[PDB]
Design a protein around this motif. Structure first.
Motif, PDB file in Angstrom:
ATOM      1  N   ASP A   1      -1.185   7.508   1.569  1.00  0.00           N
ATOM      2  CA  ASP A   1      -2.413   6.716   1.682  1.00  0.00           C
ATOM      3  C   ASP A   1      -2.396   5.353   1.003  1.00  0.00           C
ATOM      4  OD1 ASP A   1      -4.111   8.103   3.466  1.00  0.00           O
ATOM      5  OD2 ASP A   1      -5.099   9.272   1.863  1.00  0.00           O
TER       6      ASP A   1
ATOM      7  N   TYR B   1      -0.278   2.749   2.888  1.00  0.00           N
ATOM      8  CA  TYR B   1      -0.986   2.421   4.120  1.00  0.00           C
ATOM      9  C   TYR B   1      -2.145   1.490   3.806  1.00  0.00           C
ATOM     10  CZ  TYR B   1       1.379   6.654   6.018  1.00  0.00           C
ATOM     11  OH  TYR B   1       2.269   7.624   6.409  1.00  0.00           O
ATOM     12  N   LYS B   2      -2.878   1.777   2.698  1.00  0.00           N
ATOM     13  CA  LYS B   2      -4.000   0.977   2.185  1.00  0.00           C
ATOM     14  C   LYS B   2      -3.550  -0.470   1.977  1.00  0.00           C
ATOM     15  CE  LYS B   2      -7.425   3.968  -0.089  1.00  0.00           C
ATOM     16  NZ  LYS B   2      -8.461   3.968  -1.154  1.00  0.00           N
ATOM     17  N   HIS B   3      -2.346  -0.657   1.404  1.00  0.00           N
ATOM     18  CA  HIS B   3      -1.770  -1.974   1.190  1.00  0.00           C
ATOM     19  C   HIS B   3      -1.286  -2.584   2.496  1.00  0.00           C
ATOM     20  CE1 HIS B   3       1.500  -4.775  -0.224  1.00  0.00           C
ATOM     21  NE2 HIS B   3       0.347  -5.377  -0.546  1.00  0.00           N
ATOM     22  N   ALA B   4      -0.597  -1.784   3.325  1.00  0.00           N
ATOM     23  CA  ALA B   4      -0.057  -2.202   4.620  1.00  0.00           C
ATOM     24  C   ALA B   4      -1.095  -2.845   5.552  1.00  0.00           C
ATOM     25  CB  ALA B   4       0.613  -1.020   5.297  1.00  0.00           C
ATOM     26  N   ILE B   5      -2.332  -2.374   5.454  1.00  0.00           N
ATOM     27  CA  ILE B   5      -3.456  -2.869   6.223  1.00  0.00           C
ATOM     28  C   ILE B   5      -3.862  -4.284   5.770  1.00  0.00           C
ATOM     29  CG2 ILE B   5      -6.001  -2.373   6.329  1.00  0.00           C
ATOM     30  CD1 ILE B   5      -4.115  -0.928   8.610  1.00  0.00           C
ATOM     31  N   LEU B   6      -3.607  -4.621   4.502  1.00  0.00           N
ATOM     32  CA  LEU B   6      -3.933  -5.931   3.931  1.00  0.00           C
ATOM     33  C   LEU B   6      -2.777  -6.938   4.072  1.00  0.00           C
ATOM     34  CD1 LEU B   6      -6.143  -4.031   2.820  1.00  0.00           C
ATOM     35  CD2 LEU B   6      -5.942  -5.216   0.711  1.00  0.00           C
ATOM     36  N   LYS B   7      -1.931  -6.730   5.088  1.00  0.00           N
ATOM     37  CA  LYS B   7      -0.784  -7.564   5.441  1.00  0.00           C
ATOM     38  C   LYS B   7      -0.882  -7.890   6.914  1.00  0.00           C
ATOM     39  CE  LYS B   7       2.931  -5.337   3.379  1.00  0.00           C
ATOM     40  NZ  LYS B   7       3.442  -3.976   3.072  1.00  0.00           N
ATOM     41  N   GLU B   8      -1.388  -6.906   7.701  1.00  0.00           N
ATOM     42  CA  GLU B   8      -1.644  -6.937   9.153  1.00  0.00           C
ATOM     43  C   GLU B   8      -2.616  -8.071   9.584  1.00  0.00           C
ATOM     44  OE1 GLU B   8       0.071  -4.738  11.256  1.00  0.00           O
ATOM     45  OE2 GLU B   8       0.909  -3.740   9.472  1.00  0.00           O
ATOM     46  N   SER B   9      -3.379  -8.640   8.618  1.00  0.00           N
ATOM     47  CA  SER B   9      -4.332  -9.710   8.883  1.00  0.00           C
ATOM     48  C   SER B   9      -3.595 -10.941   9.310  1.00  0.00           C
ATOM     49  CB  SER B   9      -5.220 -10.000   7.678  1.00  0.00           C
ATOM     50  OG  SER B   9      -4.525 -10.622   6.610  1.00  0.00           O
TER      51      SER B   9
ATOM     52  N   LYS C   1      -7.290  -8.246  -3.024  1.00  0.00           N
ATOM     53  CA  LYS C   1      -6.165  -7.300  -2.876  1.00  0.00           C
ATOM     54  C   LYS C   1      -6.063  -6.376  -4.117  1.00  0.00           C
ATOM     55  CE  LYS C   1      -1.976  -9.139  -1.801  1.00  0.00           C
ATOM     56  NZ  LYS C   1      -0.823  -9.543  -0.955  1.00  0.00           N
TER      57      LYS C   1
END
Lengths: 351, 368
Positions: free
Chosen positions: A9, A12-20, A296
């Motif tokens: 989790d 993934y939580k961090h991975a979502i804040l790169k996808e932007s 972040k």
RNA sequence: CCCCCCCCCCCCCCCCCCCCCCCCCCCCCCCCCCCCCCCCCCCCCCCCCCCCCCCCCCCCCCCCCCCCCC
């Protein structure tokens, strides 16, 4: 057989804040002052004037410091940094009038007051000194902007706590650290200068990452000043910002506190691991995240593991490090136990 | 010898929802308001006006919040996001009249009411304050849209439950979280604002992924506001949306609940494994699937393993986490057993000198 | 400094081959039964939760190397 029951989790939580792929355009109408490189001597004098005399108001003292950073980094390179920090703020190049400096956002009246008051103090002192004031005591000395920024560096370290807490620490440390600077400019009002910097860092959030970029840039150069080499060293002690818990966490492991072996603490192992592994995933920027006031940050919270936090704090208390840390203790029982072991450890000598 | 009897059905189930080369064009005629970046100050003021005074109606409060997101993300970049969310909806750029804002879908009458009522409250208060209202208390303060969106963020977390449940949670948490904001704007009607956001997220489904993109974008920036850094932190506590069962599943393993060793539970191992392996297959988007109201979601259901679910819930009950979870318990027998073990575990204090890895001179002193 | 002796090489004998013998040669199509598959059940979801908060400038000694012989 029971393997495979696992969710990563936090990653993934961090991975979502790169996808932007999309970029935020905050501070739409905002304007801030920038000084071209050409005016570095003029801003240096103004910095010295702030330190040299006991002034009525130290409101714009911090903005003047930022103006020296501006000259040091770039006439217009600064706009790039601010735009890239996430703020869509526009810059305004500070001009000259008659000779003085017209800084955007800074009252012309204030600039003149600082200059006037400093000249008055220079005249009073030159009469006493019998016309003899050495270079090192004049507002003209080239290290005066660095000295000003060093007070800012000390408030930068304690940006993690109260506007108040920071002023204590700033004053205390400034006395030991800026010892010699204070000898030459005994009129520098550390508390008012430090207050201007707290106000600035809180209002103009983009100046936090501009300060970081000055620090990063200064840290790179081949030859630094005695004052410059101090600034970075204050800036470094600021690295573990808001992450005091994780660093005390490694201390608990190094102390081999038997409470880290408690069944309730053992249960939180995977969450704890996840946080330390995110630090490695984020690399060097991980540390200054809290300092930048980055949204972040906070993914590095040990909220998910309250029993571990209790032991870490207990261990810190027992070793006598804890000091004035307000960090809440969820498990009072575990804390006391970890504290007892650490106190026994503290005294005992082994090979 | 009889090992080749295996079907990886759940993986195939997901694989079929990738093969779609064809794309759905829903919301064919639909139109929604977008605000150009240029009008960020005007929408900021309007947001502040909502918080500043006690208004008659908070219908469009959420749409105003979306309008700030619009300015923050892009004059026209927003259309791209909405089109890419699966909705073929068209955008409408909000204009100015006399100075006011003409927001598409938002009644001109409502905009004027919000403004009028706020000015009335400003006048009443400025008389009392003796002409002294500090910047931080005015509807003009730049953090007012963020504050508005933070109420939306709290209702975003409880989008998994009732329109009702969410309002409780929103109100409770808003009091602790938006503590200081409430000090400056005590007139902000958290329940009505939070209701506008629930209504919006339910009607304009594409705004769910627009909110996610604002969150993702905000999470990326170098310098955030104190209000902004709060918003993302509310948004993060929303990650394990609708997957509460899988996270309590790892808790059951961490607790080493002996009921996970039951023969009937052991039988469901392969299905359970398949679900956790699908999470890894989907990666980071896996978590916010339920939050996006994605049709893809629900593949992460633990319906296939009722006995495991029973143990997981029992363990949660025993540890005292279960709280207000309505999740059905298939095997009442297994639940009670898992609960008993977890309650005994909860109280019991033990030490693994095995895990610590100490010298037997440090392990000597620890016994003392 | 290094180097410092002695020192052509070779030299016999000797053709090779020579027998025997074609291989193959049997048997032999393959195929041939039965047989549609399916059939139950099952929306999912539902709790809680802002993080942060201590302390801390570093530095500080001493020191040319080389030096024989051949």
């Amino acid at each position: 057989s029971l393997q495979g029951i696992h969710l990563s989790d936090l990653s993934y939580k961090h991975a979502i804040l790169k996808e932007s792929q999309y970029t935020i355009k905050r501070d739409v109408g905002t304007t801030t002052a920038v000084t071209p490189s050409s005016l570095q001597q003029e801003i240096t004098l103004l910095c010295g004037e702030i330190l040299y005399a006991k002034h009525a108001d130290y409101k714009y003292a911090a903005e003047i410091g930022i103006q020296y950073i501006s000259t040091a980094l770039g006439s217009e390179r600064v706009q790039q940094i601010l735009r890239n920090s996430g703020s869509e703020v526009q810059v305004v190049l500070t001009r000259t009038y008659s000779q003085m400096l017209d800084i955007h956002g800074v009252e012309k009246s204030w600039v003149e007051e600082i200059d006037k008051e400093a000249r008055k103090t220079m005249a009073t002192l030159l009469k006493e000194s019998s016309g003899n004031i050495p270079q090192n005591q004049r507002p003209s000395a080239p290290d005066t902007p660095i000295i000003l920024l060093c007070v800012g560096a000390l408030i930068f370290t304690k940006l993690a706590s109260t506007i108040e807490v920071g002023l204590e620490t700033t004053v205390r440390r400034a006395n030991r650290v800026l010892s010699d600077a204070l000898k030459r400019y005994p009129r520098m009002d550390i508390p008012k200068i430090a207050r201007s910097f707290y106000d600035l860092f809180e209002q103009k959030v983009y100046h936090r990452s501009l300060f970081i970029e000055y620090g990063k840039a200064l840290g790179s150069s081949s030859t630094g000043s005695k004052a410059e080499s101090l600034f970075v060293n204050i800036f470094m002690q600021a690295y573990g910002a808001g992450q005091t818990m994780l660093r005390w966490g490694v201390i608990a492991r190094s102390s081999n506190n038997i409470m880290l072996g408690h069944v309730s603490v053992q249960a939180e192992l995977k969450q704890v691991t996840e946080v330390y592994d995110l630090v490695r995933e984020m690399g060097p920027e991980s540390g200054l995240l809290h300092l930048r006031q980055s949204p972040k940050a906070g993914l590095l919270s040990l909220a998910n593991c309250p029993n571990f936090a209790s032991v870490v704090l207990g261990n810190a208390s027992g070793l006598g490090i804890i000091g004035m840390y307000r960090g809440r203790v969820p498990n009072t029982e575990l804390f006391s136990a970890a504290e007892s072991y650490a106190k026994s450890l503290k005294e005992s000598n082994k090979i």
